[PDB]
Write a protein that binds this DNA or RNA. Structure first.
Lengths: 149, 186, 82, 129, 213, 82
RNA sequence: UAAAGUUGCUGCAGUUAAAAAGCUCGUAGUUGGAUCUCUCUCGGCCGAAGCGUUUACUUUGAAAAAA
């Protein structure tokens, strides 16, 4: 079930059994890598890059075409953000909640949701620090949550 | 013109290379076999009066070979009468590291060089045009396993004869019984 | 029941089931080539697209994102592949 | 969450056997699950089974002969010694005439009788009778 | 049937099935009877696969024939629709009929008036003949039932998928079961049509009789 | 059922359910022993021989006795394939 | 002390008999999904050589007062 909710949903992607590049896909691995570089230059996260490649250009899974993952490709060339996408989005949501709570001190549900979001941020930060993706001194602070981004 | 991996060319290996050296010129792929180099070639009996020929291609060129192998194979089967020709890559299996070891490999064994990954890649190269759409392993009462492979339904009647040689080649290379079928459901 | 053959289910039963609950899971989605009167080149559209795919050859949208399958535009012919 | 997938497999087999079904779908598959099933099959308790390969973690369809009274797991996997093996088969097996305790030892996964023959203790996985 | 051509289902049987409405089930489907239907119509009526009906009818005929003493087979019908069809059947095959109310204790109370010990049990409707079906679970009594799409299959060993609602269908099913039992036994032949007409087994409400005279 | 000398010491050998291969107890009064008459190949008449199926009371209670007998007959050549 | 499966690791109980915290987060703690098959010691079977990749486990072998 959900980490911070009582729900238990089954929604997710179902990858096909085949791992081969599709028949319709004529793009070479280098072509897809250049497309990924251009999309990242446009200012998109790996999730958005994969979504756009799947929707318009058409790739079942870029890992099957290029042999690498989107974040791995971006790091290989070097375009990845300092902090990972999920952690950045969690911090952005926390900043938005705190900004709302400044003018909505009566909102006792936003405070509860902010506690949940901060807990998720702390768990993710601990995991990423374990994997050396974050500095061992990296810390999430309310005074610096927006100030760092 | 071959570059044998074992440093020991054979008569049939040299013969296969000579047939390739020909194709290269009198053909439609002068712009192909040029670098498309092989490393070894074996001829094994698959059962009954038929046999088969397995061409061992180096890994980094396989894709290039796979671009034209279907065109190449069709000619070699012509050049060798009733003998099927199969391209599999020279994938090497590093032994599983043990606590009792030697200076076998100081670094971590890559997953591509494990036995299971190499065997699966061998099974995938054994059937290049037809794809693997499903795999099953039936563990029989005697503890003996049997691999059943589902192939593409569109290439059914063109490769159904290639059965009984794919199984033979797989049993020669990996030592596992395998069957190939084409289920009704896509 | 009590003797249902789980190794070889019918294709109708497999399609009826949830995509993740099948014997071997497969997506319900697909890719299509769409022909537009205002263009001629092939553009591949995912059936469940989340972005507004645009026609390169004109100023018309190709499909609109929906909760599920994308809403293909009128006059553009979609052909599913594979 | 899901821990010790062998417990899930054995519980699924036990439940399907109690209901009188002829086949059971075990998922996920695992090396320990397959070894336990092989040990159970060599004694005629479970019969044939087939591993469905999906590219993430296989499933197993197990044909069921109605010879199984109970297949269970022992959690945590206590490290049992040979001298302490007998006590275990007093606690888990119906009689001394039938029923097996499955151990995982340095020589592989096998029943208590084969562990005694090979002169090796190990860690108790489960039992079936 | 056993895939024998001699025991295969003939044209006239199919025509009688279609005339009587035997292929038409109800709007509800029991999950135990799902293997006997073919498709659900646009109006929600389930079509009963007539081939499966023939196979189950022949299996029931074999089960009845195996009972050496013909009287040891007991045929029950509490609904009026199957009363006369039962009474004819018992006369045609030698079975013992219970048409009307089944008094509880018939099978399990040794000290009783109509205490019988049948070796086989045949009923018209498991929903309407639930008392003999439940009682057969006390005396090791195997059961044969004429089951609709929504008929429960508890204590039913041979379920014959048929329309057991309409009088024409019930009468035809009982008549065909009697005919097949006779043909299997040896009496009457399968080469010439049976002299007994299916309408003999049909239930006739008093309104139709008052119309006839 | 046999001692070291190989003598059968059991009072009797109980029937096993034809479907579940489970022992039918001495007091399972809901269990049945169906006899299905065999039929000549050319005349379709009773040969005098039959085939017997023992069904336990639990399977009868669950309503799966009909499918059980049908499966046994199908696998036994009495009910035609499909 | 056993009886006491009335201290329950084996092996109890928690709807109504005694009992699940009002609810959620959260640290230590506990538990954590598939997956990897130039060592053989000197005179063309003969003394030397150790992070031989640590562990747990398990099976040997020594060393373990008598009463």
């Amino acid at each position: 079930g959900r980490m911070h909710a009582p729900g238990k949903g089954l929604s997710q992607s179902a990858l096909p059994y085949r791992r081969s590049v599709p028949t319709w896909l004529k793009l070479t691995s280098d072509d897809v890598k250049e497309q990924i570089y251009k999309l990242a230059k446009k200012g998109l996260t790996p999730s958005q890059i994969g979504v756009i490649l799947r929707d318009s250009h058409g790739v079942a899974q870029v890992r099957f075409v290029t042999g690498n993952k989107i974040l791995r490709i971006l790091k290989s060339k070097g375009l990845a953000p300092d902090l990972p996408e999920d952690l950045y989005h969690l911090i952005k949501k926390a900043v938005a909640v705190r900004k709302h709570l400044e003018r909505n001190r009566k909102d006792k549900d936003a405070k509860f949701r902010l506690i949940l979001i901060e807990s998720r941020i702390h768990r993710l930060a601990r995991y990423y620090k374990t994997k050396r993706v974050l500095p061992p001194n990296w810390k999430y602070e309310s005074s610096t949550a927006s100030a760092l981004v | 013109i071959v570059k044998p991996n074992g440093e020991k060319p054979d008569e049939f290996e040299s013969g296969i290379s000579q047939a390739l050296l020909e194709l290269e010129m009198n053909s439609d792929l002068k712009a192909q076999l040029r670098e498309l180099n092989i490393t070894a070639a074996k001829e094994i009996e698959v059962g009954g009066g038929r046999k088969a020929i397995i061409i061992f291609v180096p890994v980094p060129q396989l894709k290039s070979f796979q671009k034209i192998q279907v065109r190449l194979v069709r000619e070699l089967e012509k050049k060798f009468s009733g003998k099927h020709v199969v391209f599999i890559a020279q994938r090497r299996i590093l032994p599983k590291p043990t606590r009792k070891s030697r200076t076998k490999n100081k670094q971590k064994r890559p997953r591509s060089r494990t036995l299971t990954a190499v065997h699966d890649a061998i099974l995938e190269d054994l059937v290049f045009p037809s794809e693997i759409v499903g795999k099953r392993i039936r563990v029989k009462l005697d503890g003996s396993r049997l691999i059943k492979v589902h192939l593409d339904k569109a290439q059914q009647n063109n490769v159904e004869h290639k059965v009984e040689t794919f199984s033979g080649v797989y049993k020669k290379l990996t030592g596992k019984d395998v069957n190939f079928e084409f289920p009704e459901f896509q | 029941p009590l003797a249902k053959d789980l190794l070889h289910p019918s294709p109708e039963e497999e399609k009826r089931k949830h995509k993740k609950k099948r014997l071997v899971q497969s997506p319900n989605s697909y890719f299509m080539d769409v022909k537009c009167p205002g263009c001629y080149k092939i553009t591949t559209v995912f059936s469940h697209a989340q972005t507004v795919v645009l026609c390169v050859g004109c100023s018309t949208v190709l499909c609109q994102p929906t909760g599920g399958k994308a809403r293909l535009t009128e006059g553009c012919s979609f052909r599913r592949k594979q | 969450v899901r821990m010790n997938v062998l417990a899930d497999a054995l519980k699924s087999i036990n439940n399907a056997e109690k209901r009188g079904k002829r086949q059971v779908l075990i998922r996920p598959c695992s090396k320990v699950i397959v070894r336990f099933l092989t040990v159970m099959m060599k004694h005629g308790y479970i019969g044939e089974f087939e591993i469905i390969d999906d590219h993430r973690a296989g499933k197993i369809v197990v044909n069921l002969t109605g010879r199984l009274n109970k297949c269970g797991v022992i959690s945590p996997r206590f490290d049992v010694q040979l001298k302490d093996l007998e006590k275990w088969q007093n606690n888990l097996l119906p009689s001394r005439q039938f029923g097996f305790i499955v151990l995982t030892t340095s020589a592989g996964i096998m029943d208590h009788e084969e562990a005694r023959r090979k002169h090796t203790g190990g860690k108790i996985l489960g039992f079936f009778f | 049937s056993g895939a024998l051509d001699v025991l295969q289902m003939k044209e006239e049987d199919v025509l009688k099935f279609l005339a009587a409405g035997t292929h038409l089930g109800g709007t509800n489907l029991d999950f135990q009877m799902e293997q006997y239907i073919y498709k659900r119509k646009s109006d929600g009526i389930y079509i009963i696969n007539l081939k499966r009906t023939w196979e189950k009818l022949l299996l029931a005929a074999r089960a009845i024939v195996a009972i050496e003493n013909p009287a040891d087979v007991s045929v029950i019908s509490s609904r009026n629709t199957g009363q006369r069809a039962v009474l004819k059947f018992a006369a045609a095959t030698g079975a013992t009929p219970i048409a009307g109310r089944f008094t509880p204790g018939t099978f399990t109370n040794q000290i009783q008036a109509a205490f019988r010990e049948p070796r086989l049990l045949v009923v018209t409707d498991p929903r309407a003949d639930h008392q003999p079906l439940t009682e057969a679970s006390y005396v090791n009594l195997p059961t044969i039932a004429l089951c609709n799409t929504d008929s429960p299959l508890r204590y039913v060993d041979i379920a014959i998928p048929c329309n057991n609602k309409g009088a024409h269908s019930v009468g035809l099913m009982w008549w065909m079961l009697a005919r097949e039992v006779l043909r299997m036994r040896g009496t009457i032949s399968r080469e010439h049509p049976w002299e007994v007409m299916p309408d003999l087994y049909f239930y006739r409400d008093p309104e139709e009789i008052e119309k006839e005279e | 059922m046999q001692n070291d000398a190989g003598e059968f010491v059991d009072l009797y050998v109980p029937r096993k359910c034809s479907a579940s291969n489970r022992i039918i107890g001495a007091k399972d009064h809901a269990s049945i022993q169906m006899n299905v008459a065999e039929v000549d190949k050319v005349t379709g008449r009773f040969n005098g021989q039959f085939k017997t199926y023992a069904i336990c009371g639990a399977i009868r209670r669950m309503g799966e006795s009909d499918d059980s007998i049908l499966r046994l007959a199908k696998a036994d050549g009495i009910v035609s394939k499909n």
